[PDB]
C-alpha cells in the first residue's frame, strides 16, 4: 500500500505540500526542508541536543554540557509516546520525509550533498520524532520560556541590603526590579482587562 505526496515549488522556491493524510502531509514537509536547509537543520539538531563538539571540537564542550544539563530527554520521549497517534504522525512523518531526502543525497552525493558537510567533514544524521520535537523545544521553549535571573537577583538584593541596610536594601530592589509598574503601556485597555491573581 502507498500514498502520494505532491511537492510544488513557486517562483521563490517555496514548497506547497499536497497529501491526503497527516503522516504523508508532514513527510512531504520534512522532505522539502531536507532539500532546502539540510545543513541548517543538522546544526539546529546538534544545537538543541548539545552534540556540536562531536563535529567541531573542544571549544564546544561547555556549550554541549550546558545544553544537555537544561532538559530531561526522558520527559520528551514520554510526552511523544503519550500524544495521540495522528499527532505522532506529524513528528514521525516529518522525521521520515527528512530521511527520505537524505537517502537521495546518498544516491548521488556529488551533486546533492550540501557543501558544508563536505568542508566540515561530517555526514547528515538520521532523523527521529525526538529530533523534530527538540528543534522546537530548544529554539522556542528554551528561548522565550526559560529565562530567569533569580539567583543573580538574590545577589543583587544581598548587595543592596549590605549597602543600604535591610529595609532600604529591600525597597531599592523593588524600585529597580519591581514586580509590576501600573503605568506600563499595555496591549489591552485596563477596562477590558486588568490582571488579578
Amino acid at each position: 500500500q502507498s500514498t502520494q505526496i505532491k511537492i510544488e515549488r513557486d517562483n521563490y522556491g517555496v514548497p506547497h505540500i499536497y497529501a491526503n493524510d497527516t503522516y504523508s502531509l508532514f513527510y512531504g514537509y520534512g522532505y522539502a526542508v531536507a532539500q532546502d536547509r539540510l545543513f541548517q537543520m543538522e546544526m539546529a539538531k546538534r544545537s538543541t541536543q548539545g552534540t556540536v563538539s562531536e563535529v567541531f571540537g573542544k571549544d564546544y564542550i561547555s556549550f554541549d554540557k550546558e545544553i544537555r544539563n537544561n532538559y530531561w530527554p526522558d520527559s520528551i520521549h514520554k510526552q511523544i509516546n503519550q500524544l495521540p497517534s495522528q499527532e505522532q504522525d506529524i513528528l514521525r512523518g516529518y522525521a521520515d520525509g527528512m530521511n527520505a531526502w537524505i537517502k537521495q543525497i546518498n544516491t548521488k552525493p556529488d551533486d546533492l550533498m550540501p557543501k558544508q558537510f563536505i568542508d566540515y567533514d561530517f555526514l547528515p544524521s538520521q532523523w527521529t520524532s525526538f529530533d523534530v520535537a527538540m528543534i522546537m523545544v530548544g529554539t522556542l521553549a528554551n528561548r522565550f520560556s526559560d529565562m530567569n535571573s533569580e539567583i543573580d537577583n538574590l545577589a543583587l538584593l544581598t548587595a543592596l541590603k549590605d549597602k543600604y541596610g535591610e529595609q532600604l536594601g529591600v525597597e531599592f530592589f523593588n524600585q529597580i526590579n519591581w514586580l509590576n509598574n501600573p503605568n506600563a503601556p499595555t496591549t489591552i485597555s485596563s477596562e477590558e482587562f486588568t490582571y488579578s491573581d
Binding site: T3, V52, I61, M147, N148, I188, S189, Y195
Partner: protein, 553 residues
C-alpha cells in the same frame, strides 16, 4: 518582536489586516522557512522558524495569526536542601529523597569522549549548587511536561476557524508567548498564552524559595487569568514585547522591565494618527518603526526643560535644538556608512553619561553594570536582535518622571543633586565628546550608521553555514527577522512576507548556490514583500517545479 492588527473598525479597503514582525536576530540561511500544507485537515501558508511542524506566521484562509514573546513569569528557582553527606540527596515533604540522575557522554572531535552527570529533583533540573549553604538550585517550569502538548496546540491553532476554536488551543499552549488573531469577518483578538504557577501566598517569584516543600506551587493558574481581548474598543492591537495588561507581572529577569517608558508607543502613536489604515499604511509604520530612534521621543522633553533659559548659542542648546527639530527617523547617508542626523550619537553619549551619574552612583558594583548601557551598544555586524530602551534608561526615565511615575524612588538616583543640573552637566559633556569625536563643524559631523548582518552562526553561536557565509546590509532595521502582512478582503485574503536571504540555503559540492539562496535579500532591504499563495488556482501561474512522491505504507 512586534505586531499590529486592525479589525473592521479601523481597517481600510479590508476587513482585517495583521502585520507581524517576529525578532530573532538575522541569519544565513534565514531563521524562518516558507511553507504551504494542503490536505488532511490542513490548508496553511506562511513561514515558521526552523521549519517547525507548527507554522507560527500565517493564515488558513479563514483565520490569520501571529505572535510576539510573552515575558510572563512561569519559571521559579527552588533552593533544595542538600544532605551534608550526600549532595545528591535532598529534603522534601518530610523525606530525604534521592535526586534523579543521568550520565551524558560527549564525543569531542580530536579528544577522548567526556562523560558528566545531570541531576533532577521533584522541582526540575539542578541548575547550580552552593556547597557552603548546602544548596542545589533547581529550575521549576510551569510548562515542564507540557512541551509536546504546547507544540501541538501550536499546530492545531492553525486549523482554527473561529475565535472559540482558537482559544481552545491557546489554553493548551504553555510557554509565555503572546498570540494574535484576525479573521475574515473583521474580528481581531489577542491572548497572552501560557501556564503560570498558582504560588504560595508570599512567594516572591523574583527570588529563590526553599524547595523543602512548603513553597511548592499549589497548582497552575486557570486560563481565565490569562490577559486576553476580543475586538478591543480601541479598534487595534499592538505589541512590541510590552505588558499585556495592567498589573501583569513580567519575568523575574533583572534586565527586563515593563515601565512607563515603552517602545510600543512608537506603534500606537502611528496607528492612532490614522482614522482607518490600509495595508499600505500598515506597511508604512513598519518602515517608520524600523528607523525611529526609541529614546528621542522619551528623553528630548527633559532635555528641553533643563536647557530652557540658556541662550541659543549655548553648546548644550545647540544639541537640544538639533534634537527638538528632529523627527527621530534615521536615514542612511549617501555613502551608506553614516546617518544623516547626529541625533542617535547624541542620545547615546548623553544617556551613557547620565547613567554613570545616577544608577552608576547608587547601584553597588558589579550590579551597576546591569544599568549602565544606553541600549545603542552596536557591533561591527550590528545589533544581534532588536533595539530597545535599556534597563538603565527605563529606570532613569522612571525617576525623571518624578511625581508622574507611580513608583516610589526609595533611593534618589540623583543622590540629592537637582536633576536639571545633572542633565545640563552631562549635556555639556556630551557636546564636548561629539566635538572631539566628530569635528568642530557640526554641519560636518558624520555619525556612524548601524549596519545589520545575516550571520553564519545561529542564535546559539553554533555555525550553521561556512565561515563568512553571511550577508551585510548597510542600514539596520529595528523590525522582525521576517515580516508577513495578511489581509482579509471582500475577495478573500491577500498576504505577503519576506524571508531573507532566501527560501533555500543550498550550495552544491561544486559551490553553486540554489537560485533561491538569496533572492529575498534586496526585497528585505528595500522594504518589499512577495506573495503568500494559499489556493491552487492562484499559486498555479507561479509554479516552477513539481515533484511526486509515492511512499510505501
Amino acid at each position: 518582536s512586534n505586531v499590529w492588527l486592525v479589525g473592521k473598525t479601523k481597517a481600510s479597503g479590508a476587513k482585517a489586516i495583521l502585520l507581524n514582525g517576529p525578532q530573532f536576530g538575522w541569519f544565513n540561511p534565514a531563521y524562518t522557512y516558507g511553507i504551504g500544507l494542503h490536505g488532511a485537515g490542513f490548508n496553511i501558508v506562511g513561514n515558521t522558524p526552523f521549519a517547525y511542524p507548527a507554522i507560527l506566521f500565517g493564515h488558513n484562509g479563514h483565520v490569520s495569526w501571529g505572535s510576539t514573546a510573552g515575558f510572563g513569569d512561569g519559571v521559579d528557582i527552588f533552593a533544595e536542601q542538600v544532605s551534608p553527606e550526600d549532595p545528591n540527596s535532598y529534603l522534601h515533604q518530610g523525606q530525604w529523597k534521592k535526586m534523579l540522575s543521568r550520565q551524558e557522554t560527549l564525543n569531542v572531535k580530536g579528544e577522548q569522549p567526556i562523560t558528566f552527570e545531570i541531576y533532577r529533583t521533584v522541582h526540575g533540573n539542578v541548575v547550580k549548587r552552593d556547597k557552603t549553604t548546602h544548596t542545589a538550585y533547581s529550575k521549576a517550569r510551569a510548562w515542564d511536561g507540557k512541551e509536546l502538548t504546547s507544540l501541538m496546540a501550536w499546530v492545531k491553532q492553525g486549523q482554527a476557524q473561529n475565535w472559540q476554536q482558537w482559544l481552545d488551543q491557546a489554553q493548551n499552549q504553555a510557554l509565555t508567548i503572546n498570540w494574535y488573531y484576525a479573521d475574515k469577518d473583521g474580528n481581531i483578538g489577542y491572548v497572552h498564552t501560557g501556564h503560570y504557577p498558582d504560588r504560595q501566598i508570599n512567594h516572591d517569584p523574583r527570588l529563590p524559595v526553599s524547595g523543602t516543600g512548603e513553597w511548592d506551587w499549589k497548582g497552575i493558574q486557570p486560563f481565565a487569568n490569562n490577559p486576553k481581548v476580543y475586538n478591543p474598543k480601541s479598534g487595534y492591537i499592538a505589541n512590541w514585547n510590552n505588558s499585556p495588561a495592567k498589573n501583569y507581572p513580567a519575568s523575574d529577569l533583572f534586565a527586563f522591565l515593563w515601565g512607563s517608558a515603552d517602545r510600543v508607543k512608537e506603534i500606537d502613536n502611528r496607528i492612532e494618527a490614522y482614522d482607518k489604515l490600509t495595508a499600505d499604511d500598515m506597511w508604512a509604520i513598519l518602515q517608520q518603526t524600523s528607523r525611529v530612534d526609541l529614546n528621542h521621543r522619551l528623553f528630548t522633553p527633559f532635555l528641553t526643560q533643563a536647557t530652557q533659559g540658556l541662550p541659543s548659542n549655548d553648546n548644550s542648546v545647540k544639541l537640544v535644538s538639533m534634537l527638538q527639530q528632529w523627527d527621530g527617523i534615521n536615514q542612511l547617508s549617501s555613502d551608506g556608512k553614516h546617518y544623516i542626523h547626529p541625533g542617535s550619537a547624541i542620545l547615546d553619549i548623553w544617556l551613557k553619561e547620565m547613567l554613570k551619574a545616577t544608577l552608576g552612583q547608587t547601584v553597588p558594583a558589579p550590579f551597576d553594570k546591569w544599568y549602565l548601557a544606553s541600549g545603542y551598544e552596536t557591533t561591527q555586524e550590528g545589533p544581534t536582535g532588536s533595539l530597545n530602551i535599556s534597563t538603565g534608561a527605563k529606570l532613569l526615565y522612571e525617576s525623571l518622571l518624578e511625581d508622574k511615575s507611580p513608583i516610589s524612588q526609595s533611593i534618589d538616583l540623583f543622590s540629592g543633586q537637582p536633576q536639571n543640573d545633572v542633565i545640563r552637566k552631562t549635556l555639556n559633556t556630551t557636546y564636548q565628546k561629539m566635538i572631539e569625536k566628530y569635528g568642530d563643524n557640526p554641519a560636518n559631523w558624520q555619525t556612524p550608521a548601524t549596519a545589520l548582518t545575516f550571520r553564519e552562526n545561529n542564535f546559539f553561536g553554533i555555525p550553521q553555514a561556512l565561515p563568512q557565509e553571511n550577508f551585510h546590509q548597510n542600514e539596520y532595521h529595528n523590525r522582525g527577522t521576517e515580516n508577513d502582512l495578511i489581509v482579509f478582503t471582500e475577495e478573500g485574503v491577500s498576504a505577503w512576507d519576506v524571508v531573507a536571504p532566501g527560501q533555500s540555503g543550498f550550495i552544491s559540492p561544486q559551490g553553486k548556490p540554489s537560485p533561491h539562496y538569496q533572492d529575498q535579500l534586496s526585497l528585505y532591504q528595500q522594504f518589499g514583500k512577495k506573495p503568500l499563495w494559499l489556493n491552487s488556482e492562484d499559486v498555479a501561474p507561479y509554479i516552477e517545479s513539481t515533484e511526486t512522491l509515492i511512499i510505501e505504507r
